[PDB]
Each structure stands twice: as structure tokens, then as C-alpha cells.
């Protein structure tokens, strides 16, 4: 067979290029773990409010 591969070219609309990285995938996977760091509470209905901003 021929040794040359034809490169792909820009179609009429072509997606925005965004660099994939390993450090960005670590940060992405960490954030979907950090998204479990919440507790359900009794809300403002406690006769105290000192945990509220």
C-alpha cells in the first residue's frame, strides 16, 4: 500500500478546539468527588443562625 495518509480538513462548521491534558482530567475527576461534600440540614428553623452567611 501507499505510505501517505491524507490529513483531515476543516468542514463547513468545525468544533472549537480545546486542549485535553492529564492535569485538567485530574481536576475534573476531583471536582466530581468534591461535589459530594454537602449535608442536608434543618434549614433556618433552629432558633440559631450563626452558620449562615
Amino acid at each position: 500500500a501507499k505510505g501517505v495518509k491524507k490529513l483531515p480538513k476543516r468542514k463547513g462548521t468545525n468544533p472549537i478546539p480545546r486542549d485535553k491534558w492529564n492535569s485538567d482530567d485530574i481536576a475534573r475527576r476531583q471536582l466530581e468527588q468534591d461535589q459530594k461534600l454537602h449535608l442536608t440540614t434543618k434549614g433556618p428553623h433552629t432558633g440559631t443562625n450563626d452558620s449562615f452567611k
Binding site: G12, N14, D24, R28, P44, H45, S51, F52, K53
Partner: protein, 242 residues
Amino acid sequence: EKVPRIGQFGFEKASEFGVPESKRTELSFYQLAYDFEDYDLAFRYTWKFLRDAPSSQIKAYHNQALQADAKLIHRKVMEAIFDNREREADIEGLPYKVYPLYNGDNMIPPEYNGTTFSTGHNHYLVSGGTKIDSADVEMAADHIREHGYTEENGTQLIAFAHKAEIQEVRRFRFGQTNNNSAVANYDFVQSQGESPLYLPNADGLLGKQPQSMWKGLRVKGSYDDVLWIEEPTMPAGYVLFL
């Protein structure tokens, strides 16, 4: 709110006579609150009116009360977003503070990917020009995406805008000048359901084509990765990015 992560340990080089140093950590958390209010309407009649009036008029007045409710709830949701002022509320006799978007106040947004914010962070932005440009759109979308909320995290951004601003945005083309001497870094791609358009160059459009609808609303197109929606409720000089 999201509980801030604990500190992390480290070992010490051992000895045959001594003992190591001790380790510890601590926690913290916080909460946010929501407003509440009461609203009411009246329907007063005379005994002659209820004797003589058609039942269709009474039923029309009832149907109009249900539509007065829809208008009230809509207004109160939209002014929660567009009114940039902090509100006090009393809940079970204690005071609380309830919030708009970041408004130049003393909350500091949490750090994300090693970028740390100051006090005075703000999401009520002025364009600095009589007509929208691509630097305004890119600035505003980046003000969201610096907090997380990025396309790699699987979000979609939406922009809701009035016709007078959409008709500027749909003219953004890569490397061309816009309003206020801004130069576009992307180009506006029409949704698949819009009026036909010739592609300007063999060097095709820098963006993916949007689908016809998002959430049952029709989409005009996309610039950057944000979808633009013609929103008839929107006031003229304003855009909501979400």
C-alpha cells in the same frame, strides 16, 4: 454549602530511640437562606350584579386571577436575578441575609484550579459601549467559567437576549472587527432551523452547529460555546448569561 476539605499529613524519618511528632485537622461549614412574602387580590360584587351578570364573566374573572398569579411569580423570580441588592429576611424571628449574584460585596468566591478571587467580585457588568461586541460576550462567559461551570465539566452556557443585541451578535465573524473596535475570536453559527446562509470561505466556521431547541425554547445560534436564545421577556439593553 460545599464543606471545605481537611488538611493532609506527612511522615517523619524514624529513629531507634525517639518517638514521632503528632498530627491534627479541623472542619468548618456554612448555609444560605431564602426570602418569603404574602400577596392577595379581592373580587367584590353587589347582590344585583350576581343576579343579573352572565356566568361567563365570573369564570373569566377566575381565569384572570390564575393569570395574575403567573405574572407575579415570574416577576419575583426575575427580580431575584436582576436586582443586584442584598435583602434582609426574618425567619422564625431571627434576621438573615439573602443574596443576588456576586455584586461587589465582601463574599469571596471559593478558589478553583488554583485561581483565588478577592472581595469585590461582581457579576453585574457594564459593557462600556453603546452596542454589544465579542469582547463583552467573551468577558461575560469567562466570568462564569472562572468559577468552574466549564464545557469540560459538562455544562452548557445559555444567553437570553433581546432582538436588538442578537442582531449584533449574529454578525460576529472570526478575525473581523465588530462594534467598539473589538475583533471576534470565534464566529456565530446559526442553529440548524434558521434561514439559509452561504458559508463565507473554504476555511469553514469556527464553531459546532447548535440543534434547533434547548429545553423547548428555539435557539438562534452559538458564539464561543454559549447558545443564544431570543427571549421576548428580556429588557432591551440587557443579556443574562446562565
